[PDB]
Design a protein around this ligand. Structure first.
Ligand code: CL
Ligand code: CL
Ligand code: CL
Lengths: 241, 241, 241
């Protein structure tokens, strides 16, 4: 068995029109297994997904929160999930491992479910440094969490060089990264926490490659950017069965 | 998403014949979503529903308990759900807000799931006092509970003037009452409790009006009298999908 | 209505060949209700079930842990469920009620889900001593458990004389034994624990007798030896719906 999977859409563009039709598609889709679906977006789409996205298996999420005022206003707005630490926050805007970890801790304290992102750059991968970089990232997050807080955290493992580039990990490479992360959590945090933790893969997931990725033992679902703007996101949800 | 919905039948009359047949209908019906179905009754039906109602989605409930002796004997009989504060207990039998609150707290402490009923009269509605009356009712219940106890409480909001009269709230009216209650629970008890709380509507729910009521964001299912004595109760269950 | 059922395969014989095909059968079977399926085996099959058994409703289990070192190595190997107290461990290998009880508690402390077996011999049954024997067995287990531990325990009631002999309890007999056990747990441990406890039946369960056994109120599934080596195990899983 695995914990409950997550199928998360990450909307980083799109037309208003294109995306309320996607919400209507999601609302009309039959999902017959236990999966938590998530639609993360900016303020552009959140009033609409809060109101319009009716499917029982879906929740909405914010894509980021800059400060404590924003965390509190998003919660009061009705948002209970948030993505933190995503790719560009770290490498384009300069958030350190510790700033990401404090944001995760603050969000958990405020009552969010948090999708905390980790992942290595092209150079870190090719120079053999994936394990050291990614385990350093998650270690910083863990330093700010108490044992019981892990029930509110989800890890998204995303190679930076796979996000939006058409370069996806092979099933074996995804499984090796996720098994590494799982082993670190089990040793440092506990087998109980490791077995309940969702570790999602993201980085060019699409409806054709999702099933074989999901079949890997340590993959618990996906964080999906480009393919979540398209009807194939429904098949990515189906791939988590 | 919403918390787990409840479809609760409230059996206040009727032939043992037609009710074994109804139990057999329920037992044979396919329900393929997460919903807690409940059949509340008086002693007339409780031995039968305890033995005969076998559907995995169903539980039995007592329709009231007058005192601690009855609570204790119902629990030993095998009953783990109870309805308290229902319409007539308050306005015909004189149970005040405080009396109902003490009964709810006693039942929770004894291990029951409690469907605690609140709701305004025709005159209170028409004179603009719904909110003050209903929030005063739930505030009295909350006074006798600790935060943790809310995991064992369900609120049933039922306008007294809608019970048994064929006068149902419109979807919009139901949603405004439920959003009001939800807001109070969030502000006074906690956003965490508010997100998990089931707030059920009752008052002339039937198989034709249930779906558009359940589509409302703050409606988590139903307490159903007259229509729960008929086969259309299965369509009310289906309306919570 | 009932807690989550369990359909557990207890593999005590079978070829590599035969059993990998069975895992493939289980992997391709559609299971459309909430049930925890378990495949318990010795070391002969555990690397294979760990890797190959991919169905979301299945977990693997070990058949015995002889000491603390074995419990730790099994957990580190990835086994999270274990069968303890099974008939031959008691009557052939001499494990007393207390040895079994201490193993149950040690496995729970090590992070296992435990299927703890109890049951009477032919002579105990015929001489009228089933209740004293079986309740003495479970009282010994309970002495070594804290209340929170029961969430990690499953009871398997198996008449020793029914294991592997083709003699199965009738539905009424199984229900009386399970109602006896349930009444003891409710009175000595608590109604809350009793209502959540899975009490499985085992002893010559097969694809033809499983449904009427599962229809009994206090039966929560099965521990299956011979018939779990055959394709009819899938019909035993279906019988828990
Ligand atoms: Cl890169
Ligand atoms: Cl009225
Ligand atoms: Cl025997």
């Amino acid at each position: 068995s695995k914990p409950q999977p997550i199928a998360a859409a990450n909307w980083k563009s799109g037309s208003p029109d294109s995306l309320s039709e996607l919400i209507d598609l999601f609302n009309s889709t039959s999902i017959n297994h236990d999966v938590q679906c998530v639609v993360a977006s900016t303020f552009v789409h959140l009033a609409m997904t809060k109101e319009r996205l009716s499917h029982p298996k879906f929740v909405i999420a914010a894509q980021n929160a800059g400060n404590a005022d924003a965390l509190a206003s998003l919660k009061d707005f009705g948002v209970n999930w948030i993505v933190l630490g995503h790719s560009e926050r770290r490498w384009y805007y300069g958030e350190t491992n510790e700033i990401v970890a404090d944001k995760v801790a603050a969000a958990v304290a405020s009552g969010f479910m948090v999708i905390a992102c980790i992942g290595e750059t092209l150079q870190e991968r090719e120079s053999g440094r994936t394990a050291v970089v990614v385990l350093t990232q998650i270690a910083a997050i863990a330093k700010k969490l108490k044992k019981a807080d892990w029930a509110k955290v989800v890890i998204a493992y995303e190679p930076v060089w796979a996000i939006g580039t058409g370069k996806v990990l092979t099933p074996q490479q995804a499984q090796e990264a996720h098994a590494l992360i799982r082993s670190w959590v089990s040793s440092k945090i506990g087998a109980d926490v490791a077995g309940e933790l969702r570790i999602l893969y993201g980085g060019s997931v699409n409806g054709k490659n999702a099933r074989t990725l999901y079949q890997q033992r340590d993959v618990n679902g996906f964080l999906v950017g480009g393919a979540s703007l398209k009807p194939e996101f429904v098949d990515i949800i189906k791939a988590t069965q």
